Amino acid sequence: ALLVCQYTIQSLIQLTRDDPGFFNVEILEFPFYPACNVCTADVNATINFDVGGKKHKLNLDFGLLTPHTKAVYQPRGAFGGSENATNLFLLELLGAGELALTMRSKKLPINITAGEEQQVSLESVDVYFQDVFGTMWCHHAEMQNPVYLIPETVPYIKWDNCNSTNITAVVRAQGLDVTLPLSLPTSAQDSNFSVKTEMLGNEIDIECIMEDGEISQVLPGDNKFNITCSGYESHVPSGGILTSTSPVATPIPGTGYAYSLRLTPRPVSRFLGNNSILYVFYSGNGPKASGGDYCIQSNIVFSDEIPASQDMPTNTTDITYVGDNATYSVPMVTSEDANSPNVTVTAFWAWPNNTETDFKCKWTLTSGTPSGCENISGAFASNRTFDITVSGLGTAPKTLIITRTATNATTTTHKVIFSKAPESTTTSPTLNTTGFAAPN
Ligand SMILES: *[C@@H]1O[C@H](CO)[C@@H](O)[C@H](O[C@@H]2O[C@H](CO)[C@@H](O)[C@H](O[C@@H]3O[C@H](CO[C@@H]4O[C@H](CO)[C@@H](O)[C@H](O[C@@H]5O[C@H](CO)[C@@H](O)[C@H](O)[C@@H]5O)[C@@H]4O)[C@@H](O)[C@H](O[C@H]4O[C@H](CO)[C@@H](O)[C@H](O)[C@@H]4O[C@H]4O[C@H](CO)[C@@H](O)[C@H](O)[C@@H]4O[C@H]4O[C@H](CO)[C@@H](O)[C@H](O[C@@H]5O[C@H](CO)[C@H](O)[C@H](O[C@@H]6O[C@H](CO)[C@H](O)[C@H](O)[C@H]6O)[C@H]5O)[C@@H]4O)[C@@H]3O)[C@H]2NC(C)=O)[C@H]1NC(C)=O
Ligand SMILES: *[C@@H]1O[C@H](CO)[C@@H](O[C@@H]2O[C@H](CO)[C@@H](O[C@@H]3O[C@H](CO[C@@H]4O[C@H](CO)[C@@H](O)[C@H](O)[C@@H]4O)[C@@H](O)[C@H](O[C@H]4O[C@H](CO)[C@@H](O)[C@H](O)[C@@H]4O[C@H]4O[C@H](CO)[C@@H](O)[C@H](O)[C@@H]4O[C@@H]4O[C@H](CO)[C@@H](O)[C@H](O[C@@H]5O[C@H](CO)[C@H](O)[C@H](O[C@@H]6O[C@H](CO)[C@H](O)[C@H](O)[C@H]6O)[C@H]5O)[C@@H]4O)[C@@H]3O)[C@H](O)[C@H]2NC(C)=O)[C@H](O)[C@H]1NC(C)=O
Ligand SMILES: *[C@@H]1O[C@H](CO)[C@@H](O[C@@H]2O[C@H](CO)[C@@H](O[C@@H]3O[C@H](CO[C@@H]4O[C@H](CO[C@@H]5O[C@H](CO)[C@@H](O)[C@H](O)[C@@H]5O)[C@@H](O)[C@H](O[C@@H]5O[C@H](CO)[C@@H](O)[C@H](O)[C@@H]5O[C@H]5O[C@H](CO)[C@@H](O)[C@H](O)[C@@H]5O)[C@@H]4O)[C@@H](O)[C@H](O[C@H]4O[C@H](CO)[C@@H](O)[C@H](O)[C@@H]4O[C@@H]4O[C@H](CO)[C@@H](O)[C@H](O)[C@@H]4O)[C@@H]3O)[C@H](O)[C@H]2NC(C)=O)[C@H](O)[C@H]1NC(C)=O
Ligand SMILES: *[C@H]1O[C@H](CO)[C@@H](O[C@@H]2O[C@H](CO)[C@@H](O)[C@H](O[C@H]3O[C@H](CO[C@H]4O[C@H](CO[C@@H]5O[C@H](CO)[C@@H](O)[C@H](O)[C@@H]5O)[C@@H](O)[C@H](O[C@H]5O[C@H](CO)[C@@H](O)[C@H](O)[C@@H]5O)[C@@H]4O)[C@@H](O)[C@H](O[C@H]4O[C@H](CO)[C@@H](O)[C@H](O)[C@@H]4O[C@@H]4O[C@H](CO)[C@@H](O)[C@H](O)[C@@H]4O)[C@@H]3O)[C@H]2NC(C)=O)[C@H](O)[C@H]1NC(C)=O
Numbered sequence: 001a002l003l004v005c006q007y008t009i010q011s012l013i014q015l016t017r018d019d020p021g022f023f024n025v026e027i028l029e030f031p032f033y034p035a036c037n038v039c040t041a042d043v044n045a046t047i048n049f050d051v052g053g054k055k056h057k058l059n060l061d062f063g064l065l066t067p068h069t070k071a072v073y074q075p076r077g078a079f080g081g082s083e084n085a086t087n088l089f090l091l092e093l094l095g096a097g098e099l100a101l102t103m104r105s106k107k108l109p110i111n112i113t114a115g116e117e118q119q120v121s122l123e124s125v126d127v128y129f130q131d132v133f134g135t136m137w138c139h140h141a142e143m144q145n146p147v148y149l150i151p152e153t154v155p156y157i158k159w160d161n162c163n164s165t166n167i168t169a170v171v172r173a174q175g176l177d178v179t180l181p182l183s184l185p186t187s188a189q190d191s192n193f194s195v196k197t198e199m200l201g202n203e204i205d206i207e208c209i210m211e212d213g214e215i216s217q218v219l220p221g222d223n224k225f226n227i228t229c230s231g232y233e234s235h236v237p238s239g240g241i242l243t244s245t246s247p248v249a250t251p252i253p254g255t256g257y258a259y260s261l262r263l264t265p266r267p268v269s270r271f272l273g274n275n276s277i278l279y280v281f282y283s284g285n286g287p288k289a290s291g292g293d294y295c296i297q298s299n300i301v302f303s304d305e306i307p308a309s310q311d312m313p314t315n316t317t318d319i320t321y322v323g324d325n326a327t328y329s330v331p332m333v334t335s336e337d338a339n340s341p342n343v344t345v346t347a348f349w350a351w352p353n354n355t356e357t358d359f360k361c362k363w364t365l366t367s368g369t370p371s372g373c374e375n376i377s378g379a380f381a382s383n384r385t386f387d388i389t390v391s392g393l394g395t396a397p398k399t400l401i402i403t404r405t406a407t408n409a410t411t412t413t414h415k416v417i418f419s420k421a422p423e424s425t426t427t428s429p430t431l432n433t434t435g436f437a438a439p440n
């Protein structure tokens with residue numbers, strides 16, 4: 001019996017230049033709860049290929065995610081494909097509340113191929129994500145024009161001369177970042193800068209290129225430029241800054257004109273393995289930026305440094321009340337539309353230790369009063385507002401983490417923090433005054 005998943009996200013993808021052969025899909029979209037360290041996630045992907053007119057499925061099983069422990073994941077088994085296919089795919093957690101999936105091309109994951117059908121296509125991708133609260137989140141990303149996986153294990157070419165500028169390039173979330181120093185003879189004012197990279201490690205060949213053109217008038221100190229690495233561009237664009245490190249016209253000897261160069265290119269897959277080599281090409285020309293003069297090269301390493309900001313953002317609200325059961329009104333689902341046919345309030349007692357018990361409080365337009373939800377109350381109010389009644393009365397400010405989500409999947413997470421019990425004034429049983437011991 002196949003998935004139901006409330007909340008499905010569409011996503012168009014296309015290939016820019018020929019690929020380095022990763023093939024990468026990122027998903028700013030799933031829920032990673034803030035102030036939650038026990039929050040597992042049940043990921044299950046599914047690629048829909050095409051061989052001849054024939055459409056062939058491939059279900060991968062990533063099992064359970066442990067965001068507070070593991071950053072990178074590999075499917076643990078996969079029904080419907082070749083073998084040694086288990087490490088053909090790669091699901092990596094990234095920055096703020098998001099995922100990326102990298103399944104390499106040039107190594108067919110479909111054995112179902114007779115020599116005849118050497119030609120294989122990748123039509124779309126399904127990434128299932130079952131919530132800690134048990135909400136299945138689907139994310140169907142579809143290749144604009146089918147992408148052709150064409151086996152190869154060819155060219156194991158390194159580049160040649162290139163002065164090694166020992167400085168290591170490190171990748172964090174598929175985003176590389178290095179600052180290489182470089183000097184350009186003949187560049188005071190009349191300098192045309194043109195950089196071009198190419199991370200050539202492993203069976204992977206990424207190739208980045210300035211797109212908006214060259215920096216024709218290289219002003220002094222921090223020129224920012226955009227670059228387009230071949231593959232599947234990331235929402236966080238990829239750029240670089242050429243900053244100057246030498247006087248205007250005030251040098252004359254050997255040291256031509258010094259510059260500090262910083263590269264920030266994106267989709268740079270771990271598949272590239274560590275000990276790959278970043279080639280940086282540059283000239284001081286405008287006639288043929290192509291294959292021009294100087295080449296500088298650096299080694300790259302893939303940190304397994306679990307991204308920091310993994311949990312989704314928060315807007316805390318402080319309440320203080322006395323009635324021994326407070327009430328917050330989770331405002332409108334997303335914004336301006338009191339006619340969604342799918343709202344979902346969702347409660348949380350901050351930093352919960354146990355999954356089988358702490359994630360039971362949930363509401364919907366058609367539900368009401370959830371099974372295991374102890375001491376939290378929730379029911380919709382006027383204009384789609386949602387009042388939550390917290391009655392777990394203590395004398396130590398509990399912070400509740402609410403999450404609401406529209407039919408659009410525009411999640412929004414509050415973080416109310418009930419100061420609760422302010423406490424009775426000492427003279428509670430008396431305090432009836434009149435000026436008698438004071439002038440009047
Ligand atoms: C990297 O990429 C980089 C960027 O993409 C690139 O820069 C780099 O590559 C190369 O770098 C080279 C330098 O390193 C550079 O040369 C390359 O770029 C260009 O070169 C071409 C070709 O150049 C020339 O060859 C011509 C023929 O041989 C020659 O006419 C030119 O000029 C002379 O000056 C010498 C010095 O006196 C003289 O000995 C010569 O005999 C000759 O007269 C030059 O040798 C250029 O064509 C091209 O561009 C134009 O732009 C440049 C820069 O602006 C000019 O030098 C050139 O003349 C031409 O431009 C003008 O064009 C527009 C359109 O009309 C004008 O509106 C604009 O303002 C500009 O001109 C002025 O010139 C007019 C014509 O003479 C004047 O009439 C005008 O008027 C005046 O008003 C003023 C106030 O408003 C004053 O009043 C002034 O004054 C005098 O005033 C006194 C009293 O005060 C009195 O009244 C008197 O009567 C009066 O006369 C008025 O005249 C105004 O002055 C390029 O710029 C470059 N490559 C490229 C493609 O960029 C790349 N690197 C690599 C390695 O890849
Ligand atoms: C590194 O990467 C970075 C990211 O890529 C990059 O940064 C980007 O740089 C960009 C610059 O290219 C920036 O985009 C711009 O930013 C300026 C800031 O405002 C923004 O608005 C953007 C779009 O809405 C938005 O994306 C941004 O976030 C931002 O908020 C903006 O001012 C810029 O300029 C204008 O100029 C561009 C370029 O030409 C033009 O496309 C825009 O329309 C706009 O210019 C108009 O207005 C002026 C004055 O009125 C006119 O002089 C212009 O001619 C033009 O206007 C019109 O004439 C038409 C004819 O009469 C008329 O139709 C138009 O009106 C309405 O226009 C509608 C569409 O625009 C539509 O056409 C509508 O429709 C009817 O249409 C039908 C048919 O459809 C019929 O024609 C009908 O007749 C008609 O009525 C019209 O009525 C106008 O009046 C520019 O947008 C961006 O900020 C930035 N991004 C980021 C995140 O940084 C870096 O640069 C890269 N780094 C390097 C170093 O390169
Ligand atoms: C990998 O990296 C390496 C290094 O990081 C890159 O190396 C280099 O490639 C470039 C080309 O890309 C070569 O280019 C030109 O080089 C010259 C000269 O180089 C020096 O030669 C001096 C003089 O003698 C001669 O030797 C050369 C070559 O054999 C012949 O061409 C001549 O005919 C002549 O025989 C020599 O004096 C100078 O230095 C000495 O220093 C050493 C060590 O200190 C001593 O052993 C020696 O005794 C000398 O002592 C000196 O030391 C004292 C003490 O400080 C000092 O007082 C003295 O004054 C003296 O320095 C070198 O050995 C360079 O002149 C050219 O310069 C032009 O560029 C300038 C910089 O921007 C600019 O300011 C100038 O105006 C010139 O510019 C213009 O050229 C353009 C383009 O052609 C024109 O369009 C424009 O209009 C102008 O004409 C120029 O740089 C380098 O020589 C080469 N370096 C090495 C070490 O090999 C390599 O490229 C890179 N590879 C890749 C793929 O990126
Ligand atoms: C909160 O509210 C929202 C809104 O109400 C709810 O969202 C709705 O959610 C429900 C389910 O919960 C969705 O059903 C519903 O609609 C869309 O999805 C269904 C399913 O679509 C796709 O899946 C089909 C099932 O397939 C799988 O099948 C394979 C093999 O068969 C299995 O092995 C897999 O394991 C897997 O499970 C596919 O068959 C289907 O299509 C095939 O077609 C492809 C392209 O045409 C082809 O290339 C591919 O190879 C496949 O073979 C697809 O992948 C759809 O049925 C609905 O779509 C219609 O459009 C289809 C495509 O255009 C037509 O084929 C179909 O006849 C439908 O009819 C059309 O209507 C249009 C416009 O009115 C008209 O022009 C046209 O003439 C047709 O009559 C649909 O897109 C969404 N509804 C909305 C509004 O988005 C949400 O569930 C709820 N949440 C909560 C909390 O409960």
Ligand SMILES: *C1O[C@H](CO)[C@@H](O[C@@H]2O[C@H](CO)[C@@H](O[C@H]3O[C@H](CO[C@@H]4O[C@H](CO[C@@H]5O[C@H](CO)[C@@H](O)[C@H](O)[C@@H]5O)[C@@H](O)[C@H](O)[C@@H]4O)[C@@H](O)[C@H](O[C@H]4O[C@H](CO)[C@@H](O)[C@H](O)[C@@H]4O[C@@H]4O[C@H](CO)[C@@H](O)[C@H](O)[C@@H]4O)[C@@H]3O)[C@H](O)[C@H]2NC(C)=O)[C@H](O)[C@H]1NC(C)=O
Nearest residue numbers: 081082083084085107108109110111153156202203273275
């Ligand atoms: C499922 O996957 C399996 C395996 O992944 C697929 O099947 C296999 O078929 C491969 C060939 O197509 C076999 O080749 C491996 O071993 C090679 C030999 O090993 C190094 O080779 C040196 C030189 O070679 C010969 O020596 C042999 C023994 O002496 C001899 O038979 C032969 O005649 C030659 O004389 C040898 O001296 C040295 O001691 C060592 O044996 C090796 O060259 C193969 O390539 C590698 O390349 C990949 C890609 O990087 C790496 O992942 C591998 O670990 C391995 O090693 C490196 O190469 C890197 C890049 O150059 C380098 O940077 C790095 O440092 C390292 O040295 C290959 O390993 C397999 O043995 C065979 N496997 C099995 C189990 O039978 C199978 O088809 C797949 N199935 C499907 C459906 O897809």
Ligand SMILES: *[C@@H]1O[C@H](CO)[C@@H](O[C@@H]2O[C@H](CO)[C@@H](O)[C@H](O[C@H]3O[C@H](CO[C@H]4O[C@H](CO)[C@@H](O)[C@H](O)[C@@H]4O)[C@@H](O)[C@H](O[C@H]4O[C@H](CO)[C@@H](O)[C@H](O)[C@@H]4O)[C@@H]3O)[C@H]2NC(C)=O)[C@H](O)[C@H]1NC(C)=O
Nearest residue numbers: 323324325326327374375376377378388389390391392393
């Ligand atoms: C703050 O919020 C809390 C919850 O969010 C509000 O809830 C009250 O809190 C207490 C717990 O702290 C609940 O126990 C309370 O409960 C029900 O209490 C009744 C029990 O009745 C009595 O009689 C027996 C037998 O003689 C006796 O042994 C016992 O001690 C007691 O005296 C239930 O009967 C009642 O349910 C019934 O009544 C309705 C209407 O007729 C029926 O439709 C129901 O089916 C059911 O039979 C209560 O549910 C709970 N109180 C209420 C009224 O909700 C708390 O009120 C709130 N504080 C304020 C002031 O807002």
Ligand SMILES: *[C@@H]1O[C@H](CO)[C@@H](O)[C@H](O[C@@H]2O[C@H](CO)[C@@H](O[C@H]3O[C@H](CO)[C@@H](O)[C@H](O)[C@@H]3O)[C@H](O)[C@H]2NC(C)=O)[C@H]1NC(C)=O
Nearest residue numbers: 009010334335336337338339340341342406407408409410
């Ligand atoms: C999220 O869910 C909302 C509530 O259902 C959608 O309205 C919203 O919208 C796409 O958003 C568009 C912006 O209003 C809207 O667009 C179109 O058609 C009109 C009429 O020709 C044009 O004026 C607009 O330019 C626009 O193309 C669509 O209704 C909407 N699509 C759907 C199916 O809702 C969703 N937003 C997101 C994140 O997708």
